[PDB]
Every structure is written in C-alpha cells, then in structure tokens.
CSV table of N, CA and C and ligand atoms in Angstrom, one decimal:
chain,number,residue,atom,x,y,z
A,1,UNK,N,-84.9,9.3,-28.4
A,1,UNK,CA,-84.0,8.1,-28.4
A,1,UNK,C,-84.9,6.8,-28.7
A,2,UNK,N,-84.4,5.6,-28.4
A,2,UNK,CA,-85.1,4.4,-28.6
A,2,UNK,C,-86.0,4.2,-27.3
A,3,UNK,N,-86.1,3.0,-26.7
A,3,UNK,CA,-87.0,2.7,-25.6
A,3,UNK,C,-86.7,3.6,-24.4
A,4,UNK,N,-87.6,4.5,-24.0
A,4,UNK,CA,-87.5,5.3,-22.8
A,4,UNK,C,-88.4,4.9,-21.7
A,5,UNK,N,-87.9,4.6,-20.5
A,5,UNK,CA,-88.7,4.1,-19.3
A,5,UNK,C,-88.9,5.2,-18.3
A,6,UNK,N,-90.1,5.7,-18.1
A,6,UNK,CA,-90.5,6.8,-17.1
A,6,UNK,C,-90.7,6.2,-15.7
A,7,UNK,N,-89.7,6.3,-14.9
A,7,UNK,CA,-89.7,5.7,-13.5
A,7,UNK,C,-90.4,6.6,-12.5
A,8,UNK,N,-91.7,6.5,-12.5
A,8,UNK,CA,-92.7,7.2,-11.6
A,8,UNK,C,-93.1,6.2,-10.4
A,9,UNK,N,-93.8,6.8,-9.4
A,9,UNK,CA,-94.2,6.0,-8.2
A,9,UNK,C,-95.2,4.9,-8.5
A,10,UNK,N,-96.0,5.1,-9.5
A,10,UNK,CA,-97.1,4.2,-9.7
A,10,UNK,C,-96.8,3.0,-10.7
A,11,UNK,N,-95.5,2.7,-10.9
A,11,UNK,CA,-95.1,1.7,-11.9
A,11,UNK,C,-94.5,2.4,-13.1
A,12,UNK,N,-93.3,2.0,-13.5
A,12,UNK,CA,-92.7,2.5,-14.7
A,12,UNK,C,-93.5,2.0,-16.0
A,13,UNK,N,-93.4,2.8,-17.1
A,13,UNK,CA,-94.4,2.8,-18.1
A,13,UNK,C,-93.9,2.5,-19.6
A,14,UNK,N,-92.6,2.7,-19.9
A,14,UNK,CA,-92.0,2.3,-21.1
A,14,UNK,C,-92.6,2.9,-22.4
A,15,UNK,N,-92.0,4.0,-22.8
A,15,UNK,CA,-92.3,4.6,-24.1
A,15,UNK,C,-91.4,3.9,-25.2
A,16,UNK,N,-91.9,2.9,-26.0
A,16,UNK,CA,-91.1,2.2,-27.0
A,16,UNK,C,-91.0,3.1,-28.2
A,17,UNK,N,-90.2,4.2,-28.0
A,17,UNK,CA,-90.1,5.3,-29.0
A,17,UNK,C,-89.8,4.7,-30.4
A,18,UNK,N,-88.9,3.6,-30.3
A,18,UNK,CA,-88.7,2.7,-31.4
A,18,UNK,C,-89.9,1.8,-31.7
A,19,UNK,N,-90.2,0.8,-30.9
A,19,UNK,CA,-91.1,-0.3,-31.2
A,19,UNK,C,-92.5,0.2,-31.6
A,20,UNK,N,-93.0,1.2,-30.9
A,20,UNK,CA,-94.2,1.9,-31.4
A,20,UNK,C,-94.0,2.4,-32.8
A,21,UNK,N,-93.0,3.2,-33.1
A,21,UNK,CA,-92.6,3.7,-34.4
A,21,UNK,C,-92.4,2.7,-35.5
A,22,UNK,N,-91.8,1.5,-35.2
A,22,UNK,CA,-91.6,0.4,-36.1
A,22,UNK,C,-93.0,0.0,-36.7
A,23,UNK,N,-94.1,0.2,-36.0
A,23,UNK,CA,-95.5,0.1,-36.5
A,23,UNK,C,-96.0,1.4,-37.1
A,24,UNK,N,-95.9,2.5,-36.2
A,24,UNK,CA,-96.7,3.7,-36.3
A,24,UNK,C,-96.0,4.9,-37.1
A,25,UNK,N,-94.7,4.7,-37.5
A,25,UNK,CA,-94.0,5.6,-38.4
A,25,UNK,C,-93.9,7.1,-38.0
A,26,UNK,N,-93.5,7.3,-36.7
A,26,UNK,CA,-93.3,8.7,-36.1
A,26,UNK,C,-94.6,9.6,-36.1
A,27,UNK,N,-95.1,9.9,-37.3
A,27,UNK,CA,-96.2,10.8,-37.6
A,27,UNK,C,-97.3,10.6,-36.7
A,28,UNK,N,-97.7,9.3,-36.4
A,28,UNK,CA,-98.6,8.8,-35.5
A,28,UNK,C,-98.6,9.6,-34.1
A,29,UNK,N,-97.4,10.0,-33.7
A,29,UNK,CA,-97.2,10.7,-32.4
A,29,UNK,C,-96.7,12.1,-32.6
A,30,UNK,N,-96.5,12.6,-33.8
A,30,UNK,CA,-95.7,13.8,-34.2
A,30,UNK,C,-96.2,14.4,-35.5
A,31,UNK,N,-97.0,15.5,-35.4
A,31,UNK,CA,-97.5,16.2,-36.5
A,31,UNK,C,-96.4,16.9,-37.4
A,32,UNK,N,-95.8,16.1,-38.2
A,32,UNK,CA,-94.8,16.6,-39.2
A,32,UNK,C,-93.4,16.8,-38.6
A,33,UNK,N,-93.3,17.7,-37.6
A,33,UNK,CA,-92.1,18.1,-36.9
A,33,UNK,C,-92.0,17.3,-35.6
A,34,UNK,N,-91.1,16.3,-35.4
A,34,UNK,CA,-91.0,15.6,-34.2
A,34,UNK,C,-90.2,16.4,-33.2
A,35,UNK,N,-90.8,16.5,-31.9
A,35,UNK,CA,-90.2,17.2,-30.8
A,35,UNK,C,-90.7,16.7,-29.5
A,36,UNK,N,-90.1,17.2,-28.4
A,36,UNK,CA,-90.4,16.7,-27.1
A,36,UNK,C,-91.8,17.2,-26.6
A,37,UNK,N,-92.8,16.3,-26.7
A,37,UNK,CA,-94.2,16.6,-26.2
A,37,UNK,C,-94.1,16.4,-24.6
A,38,UNK,N,-94.6,17.3,-23.9
A,38,UNK,CA,-94.6,17.2,-22.4
A,38,UNK,C,-95.6,16.2,-21.9
A,39,UNK,N,-95.1,15.0,-21.5
A,39,UNK,CA,-95.8,13.9,-20.9
A,39,UNK,C,-95.8,14.0,-19.4
A,40,UNK,N,-96.9,13.8,-18.8
A,40,UNK,CA,-97.2,13.8,-17.4
A,40,UNK,C,-98.5,13.1,-17.1
A,41,UNK,N,-98.8,12.9,-15.8
A,41,UNK,CA,-100.0,12.3,-15.3
A,41,UNK,C,-101.3,13.2,-15.7
A,42,UNK,N,-101.1,14.4,-16.2
A,42,UNK,CA,-102.1,15.1,-16.9
A,42,UNK,C,-102.2,14.6,-18.4
A,43,UNK,N,-101.2,14.8,-19.2
A,43,UNK,CA,-101.2,14.5,-20.6
A,43,UNK,C,-101.6,13.0,-20.9
A,44,UNK,N,-100.8,12.1,-20.3
A,44,UNK,CA,-100.8,10.7,-20.5
A,44,UNK,C,-102.1,10.0,-20.1
A,45,UNK,N,-102.9,10.6,-19.3
A,45,UNK,CA,-104.2,10.2,-18.8
A,45,UNK,C,-105.4,10.9,-19.5
A,46,UNK,N,-105.1,12.0,-20.1
A,46,UNK,CA,-106.2,12.8,-20.7
A,46,UNK,C,-106.4,12.3,-22.2
A,47,UNK,N,-105.4,12.4,-23.0
A,47,UNK,CA,-105.5,12.3,-24.4
A,47,UNK,C,-104.3,11.6,-25.1
A,48,UNK,N,-103.1,12.2,-24.8
A,48,UNK,CA,-101.8,11.6,-25.3
A,48,UNK,C,-101.7,10.1,-24.7
A,49,UNK,N,-101.3,9.2,-25.6
A,49,UNK,CA,-101.3,7.8,-25.4
A,49,UNK,C,-102.7,7.2,-25.3
A,50,UNK,N,-103.5,7.6,-24.4
A,50,UNK,CA,-104.9,7.2,-24.1
A,50,UNK,C,-105.7,7.1,-25.4
A,51,UNK,N,-105.9,8.2,-26.1
A,51,UNK,CA,-106.9,8.3,-27.2
A,51,UNK,C,-106.6,7.2,-28.3
A,52,UNK,N,-105.3,7.1,-28.6
A,52,UNK,CA,-104.8,6.0,-29.5
A,52,UNK,C,-105.2,4.6,-29.0
A,53,UNK,N,-104.8,4.4,-27.7
A,53,UNK,CA,-105.1,3.1,-27.1
A,53,UNK,C,-106.6,2.8,-27.1
A,54,UNK,N,-107.5,3.8,-26.7
A,54,UNK,CA,-108.9,3.8,-26.7
A,54,UNK,C,-109.4,3.5,-28.2
A,55,UNK,N,-108.8,4.1,-29.2
A,55,UNK,CA,-109.2,3.9,-30.6
A,55,UNK,C,-109.0,2.5,-31.1
A,56,UNK,N,-108.2,1.7,-30.4
A,56,UNK,CA,-108.0,0.3,-30.7
A,56,UNK,C,-108.3,-0.6,-29.5
A,57,UNK,N,-107.9,-1.9,-29.6
A,57,UNK,CA,-108.0,-2.8,-28.4
A,57,UNK,C,-106.8,-2.6,-27.5
A,58,UNK,N,-106.6,-1.3,-27.0
A,58,UNK,CA,-105.5,-1.0,-26.2
A,58,UNK,C,-105.6,-1.6,-24.8
A,59,UNK,N,-104.5,-1.6,-24.0
A,59,UNK,CA,-104.5,-2.0,-22.6
A,59,UNK,C,-105.1,-1.0,-21.7
A,60,UNK,N,-106.5,-0.9,-21.8
A,60,UNK,CA,-107.3,0.1,-21.1
A,60,UNK,C,-107.4,-0.2,-19.6
A,61,UNK,N,-106.3,-0.1,-18.9
A,61,UNK,CA,-106.2,-0.4,-17.5
A,61,UNK,C,-104.9,0.2,-16.9
A,62,UNK,N,-104.8,0.6,-15.6
A,62,UNK,CA,-103.7,1.2,-15.0
A,62,UNK,C,-102.4,0.3,-15.2
A,63,UNK,N,-102.5,-0.9,-14.7
A,63,UNK,CA,-101.5,-2.0,-14.9
A,63,UNK,C,-101.3,-2.4,-16.4
A,64,UNK,N,-102.1,-1.9,-17.3
A,64,UNK,CA,-101.9,-2.1,-18.7
A,64,UNK,C,-100.8,-1.2,-19.2
A,65,UNK,N,-100.5,-0.1,-18.6
A,65,UNK,CA,-99.4,0.8,-18.8
A,65,UNK,C,-98.3,0.6,-17.8
A,66,UNK,N,-98.7,0.7,-16.5
A,66,UNK,CA,-97.7,0.7,-15.4
A,66,UNK,C,-97.3,-0.7,-14.9
A,67,UNK,N,-96.0,-1.0,-14.9
A,67,UNK,CA,-95.6,-2.2,-14.2
A,67,UNK,C,-96.0,-2.3,-12.8
A,68,UNK,N,-96.7,-3.3,-12.4
A,68,UNK,CA,-97.2,-3.6,-11.0
A,68,UNK,C,-97.4,-5.1,-10.7
B,1,HEC,C1,-95.7,8.2,-29.6
B,1,HEC,C2,-95.9,7.0,-28.7
B,1,HEC,C3,-94.3,8.4,-30.0
B,1,HEC,C4,-93.6,7.7,-31.1
B,1,HEC,C5,-94.0,6.3,-31.6
B,1,HEC,C6,-92.5,8.6,-31.4
B,1,HEC,N1,-92.4,9.5,-30.6
B,1,HEC,FE1,-90.9,10.8,-30.5
B,1,HEC,N2,-91.6,11.5,-28.8
B,1,HEC,C7,-92.7,11.0,-28.2
B,1,HEC,C8,-92.7,11.6,-26.8
B,1,HEC,C9,-93.7,11.1,-25.8
B,1,HEC,C10,-91.7,12.4,-26.7
B,1,HEC,C11,-91.2,13.1,-25.4
B,1,HEC,C12,-90.1,12.3,-24.7
B,1,HEC,C13,-89.4,13.1,-23.6
B,1,HEC,O1,-89.3,12.6,-22.5
B,1,HEC,O2,-89.0,14.3,-23.9
B,1,HEC,C14,-91.0,12.3,-28.0
B,1,HEC,C15,-89.8,13.0,-28.2
B,1,HEC,C16,-89.2,12.9,-29.4
B,1,HEC,C17,-88.0,13.7,-29.7
B,1,HEC,C18,-87.1,14.4,-28.8
B,1,HEC,C19,-85.6,13.8,-28.8
B,1,HEC,C20,-85.5,12.3,-28.6
B,1,HEC,O3,-86.5,11.5,-28.3
B,1,HEC,O4,-84.3,11.8,-28.6
B,1,HEC,C21,-87.8,13.5,-31.1
B,1,HEC,C22,-86.9,14.2,-31.9
B,1,HEC,C23,-88.7,12.4,-31.4
B,1,HEC,N3,-89.6,12.2,-30.5
B,1,HEC,C24,-88.7,11.8,-32.7
B,1,HEC,C25,-89.4,10.8,-33.0
B,1,HEC,C26,-89.2,10.1,-34.2
B,1,HEC,C27,-88.3,10.4,-35.3
B,1,HEC,C28,-90.1,9.0,-34.2
B,1,HEC,C29,-90.2,7.9,-35.2
B,1,HEC,C30,-89.0,6.9,-35.2
B,1,HEC,C31,-90.8,9.1,-32.9
B,1,HEC,N4,-90.4,10.2,-32.2
B,1,HEC,C32,-91.8,8.3,-32.5
B,1,HEC,C33,-93.6,10.2,-28.6
B,1,HEC,C34,-93.4,9.4,-29.7
B,2,HEC,C1,-101.1,5.3,-31.3
B,2,HEC,C2,-100.9,6.6,-32.0
B,2,HEC,C3,-100.4,5.0,-30.0
B,2,HEC,C4,-99.9,6.0,-29.1
B,2,HEC,C5,-100.0,7.5,-29.3
B,2,HEC,C6,-99.4,5.2,-28.0
B,2,HEC,N1,-99.6,3.9,-28.2
B,2,HEC,FE1,-99.0,2.5,-26.9
B,2,HEC,N2,-99.7,1.2,-28.2
B,2,HEC,C7,-100.2,1.4,-29.4
B,2,HEC,C8,-100.4,0.2,-30.1
B,2,HEC,C9,-100.9,0.0,-31.5
B,2,HEC,C10,-100.0,-0.8,-29.2
B,2,HEC,C11,-99.8,-2.2,-29.7
B,2,HEC,C12,-101.0,-3.0,-30.3
B,2,HEC,C13,-100.7,-4.3,-31.0
B,2,HEC,O1,-100.3,-5.1,-31.9
B,2,HEC,O2,-100.2,-3.5,-31.9
B,2,HEC,C14,-99.6,-0.1,-28.0
B,2,HEC,C15,-99.2,-0.8,-26.9
B,2,HEC,C16,-98.7,-0.2,-25.9
B,2,HEC,C17,-98.2,-0.9,-24.7
B,2,HEC,C18,-98.4,-2.4,-24.4
B,2,HEC,C19,-97.4,-3.3,-25.1
B,2,HEC,C20,-97.8,-4.8,-25.1
B,2,HEC,O3,-97.1,-5.6,-24.5
B,2,HEC,O4,-98.8,-5.1,-25.8
B,2,HEC,C21,-97.6,0.0,-23.9
B,2,HEC,C22,-96.9,-0.3,-22.6
B,2,HEC,C23,-97.9,1.3,-24.5
B,2,HEC,N3,-98.5,1.1,-25.7
B,2,HEC,C24,-97.5,2.4,-23.9
B,2,HEC,C25,-97.8,3.6,-24.5
B,2,HEC,C26,-97.5,4.9,-23.8
B,2,HEC,C27,-97.1,5.1,-22.4
B,2,HEC,C28,-97.8,5.8,-24.7
B,2,HEC,C29,-97.6,7.3,-24.6
B,2,HEC,C30,-96.3,7.7,-23.9
B,2,HEC,C31,-98.4,5.1,-25.9
B,2,HEC,N4,-98.4,3.8,-25.7
B,2,HEC,C32,-98.9,5.8,-26.9
B,2,HEC,C33,-100.5,2.6,-29.9
B,2,HEC,C34,-100.2,3.8,-29.3
B,3,HEC,C1,-100.6,4.4,-20.4
B,3,HEC,C2,-101.3,5.0,-21.6
B,3,HEC,C3,-101.2,4.9,-19.1
B,3,HEC,C4,-102.4,4.5,-18.5
B,3,HEC,C5,-103.5,3.6,-19.1
B,3,HEC,C6,-102.4,5.0,-17.2
B,3,HEC,N1,-101.3,5.7,-17.0
B,3,HEC,FE1,-100.7,6.5,-15.3
B,3,HEC,N2,-99.2,7.4,-16.2
B,3,HEC,C7,-98.9,7.2,-17.4
B,3,HEC,C8,-97.7,8.0,-17.8
B,3,HEC,C9,-97.0,8.1,-19.1
B,3,HEC,C10,-97.4,8.7,-16.6
B,3,HEC,C11,-96.1,9.5,-16.5
B,3,HEC,C12,-95.3,9.6,-15.2
B,3,HEC,C13,-95.7,10.8,-14.3
B,3,HEC,O1,-95.4,10.8,-13.1
B,3,HEC,O2,-96.5,11.7,-14.8
B,3,HEC,C14,-98.4,8.3,-15.6
B,3,HEC,C15,-98.4,8.7,-14.3
B,3,HEC,C16,-99.2,8.1,-13.4
B,3,HEC,C17,-99.0,8.4,-12.0
B,3,HEC,C18,-98.1,9.4,-11.3
B,3,HEC,C19,-97.1,8.7,-10.3
B,3,HEC,C20,-96.1,9.6,-9.7
B,3,HEC,O3,-95.0,9.2,-9.4
B,3,HEC,O4,-96.5,10.8,-9.4
B,3,HEC,C21,-100.0,7.7,-11.4
B,3,HEC,C22,-100.5,7.9,-9.9
B,3,HEC,C23,-100.7,7.0,-12.4
B,3,HEC,N3,-100.1,7.2,-13.6
B,3,HEC,C24,-101.8,6.2,-12.2
B,3,HEC,C25,-102.5,5.7,-13.1
B,3,HEC,C26,-103.7,5.0,-12.8
B,3,HEC,C27,-104.3,4.8,-11.5
B,3,HEC,C28,-104.2,4.6,-14.0
B,3,HEC,C29,-105.5,3.8,-14.3
B,3,HEC,C30,-106.8,4.6,-14.1
B,3,HEC,C31,-103.2,5.0,-15.0
B,3,HEC,N4,-102.2,5.7,-14.4
B,3,HEC,C32,-103.3,4.8,-16.3
B,3,HEC,C33,-99.4,6.4,-18.3
B,3,HEC,C34,-100.6,5.7,-18.1
C-alpha cells in the first residue's frame, strides 16, 4: 500500500511505502520481485531499514524511527 504505520509499544514507526519509493524506486527495498518482507524488532534493528540508514546520514537513533 502507500504509507503504513506499525503501531508497536515503543513508538509507531511509519513505513512511507510511497514517499521512500518516490526517491528509491521500489528496487531499493525489493530485489526485482516486490513482496511482503517480514519486518520485526529482529529484522528492522539488524539490517532491514538499518543498513540503508547507516549507509547515509540516516536518523541513527531510537526516536529517529519511533515516535516518542
Ligand atoms: C523499503 C523501505 C520499501 C519500499 C520503499 C518499498 N517497499 Fe514494498 N514493502 C516493504 C516492506 C517493509 C514490506 C512489508 C509490509 C508488510 O507489512 O507486509 C513491503 C511490502 C510490499 C508489498 C506487499 C503488498 C502491499 O504493500 O500492498 C508489495 C507488493 C510491495 N511492497 C511493493 C512495493 C513497490 C511496488 C514499491 C515501490 C513503489 C515498494 N514496495 C517500495 C518495503 C518497501
Ligand atoms: C534505503 C534503501 C532505505 C531503507 C531500506 C529505509 N529507509 Fe528510511 N530513509 C531512507 C532515506 C534516504 C531517508 C530520507 C533521507 C533524505 O532526504 O532523503 C529515510 C528516512 C526515514 C525516516 C525519517 C523521515 C524524515 O523525517 O527525515 C523514517 C521514519 C524512515 N526512514 C523509516 C524507515 C523504516 C522504518 C524503514 C524500514 C521499514 C526504512 N526507513 C527503510 C532510506 C531508507
Ligand atoms: C528504524 C530504522 C528503527 C530504528 C532506528 C529502531 N527501531 Fe525499533 N523498531 C523498528 C521497527 C520497524 C519495529 C517494528 C515493530 C515491532 O514490534 O517489531 C521496531 C520495533 C521496536 C520495538 C518493539 C516494541 C514492541 O511493541 O514489542 C522496540 C522495543 C524498539 N523497536 C526499540 C527500539 C530502540 C530502543 C531503538 C534504538 C536503539 C530502535 N528501536 C531503533 C524500527 C526501528
């Protein structure tokens, strides 16, 4: 879909499925075939989201992703 907000206990986080793509052109998050990647407090903190953010001047902070 477009903007998807993950309402977890530690602050909701906002996947701008659209706005990220309006820069990043799907492929950036999706190796050729776009599909539902399992996002969790495992994935989202290990590599998914993180490594891209790390690779730029990303919001490298908990409150940088989570509303608080
Ligand atoms: C990385 C930040 C992403 C961008 C930018 C795009 N997608 Fe994505 N997509 C991403 C995740 C984290 C997920 C899982 C969402 C969930 O809770 O299941 C997805 C999922 C999809 C899906 C599933 C169906 C849907 O979202 O309606 C598809 C088909 C999909 N993504 C397509 C897609 C396209 C076409 C993108 C460019 C406009 C795109 N995604 C960007 C992560 C990210
Ligand atoms: C690169 C492949 C990215 C992935 C994967 C994710 N994000 Fe991201 N994010 C990315 C960029 C380039 C930026 C914006 C930088 C500037 O001009 O471009 C962001 C920013 C965010 C933000 C902050 C928005 C703001 O007000 O600046 C959020 C909330 C964010 N990203 C969340 C987010 C999540 C939760 C992701 C995985 C589900 C994720 N991003 C992946 C690049 C990339
Ligand atoms: C954006 C790239 C994130 C950063 C930086 C951090 N977190 Fe995160 N976190 C992110 C996502 C996409 C999720 C998904 C929701 C889920 O419940 O898995 C999470 C989840 C958490 C949770 C879980 C809360 C719950 O209800 O169980 C916590 C406790 C959490 N995140 C904490 C947290 C902290 C302390 C961070 C800084 C070190 C942090 N997150 C960074 C995305 C992102």
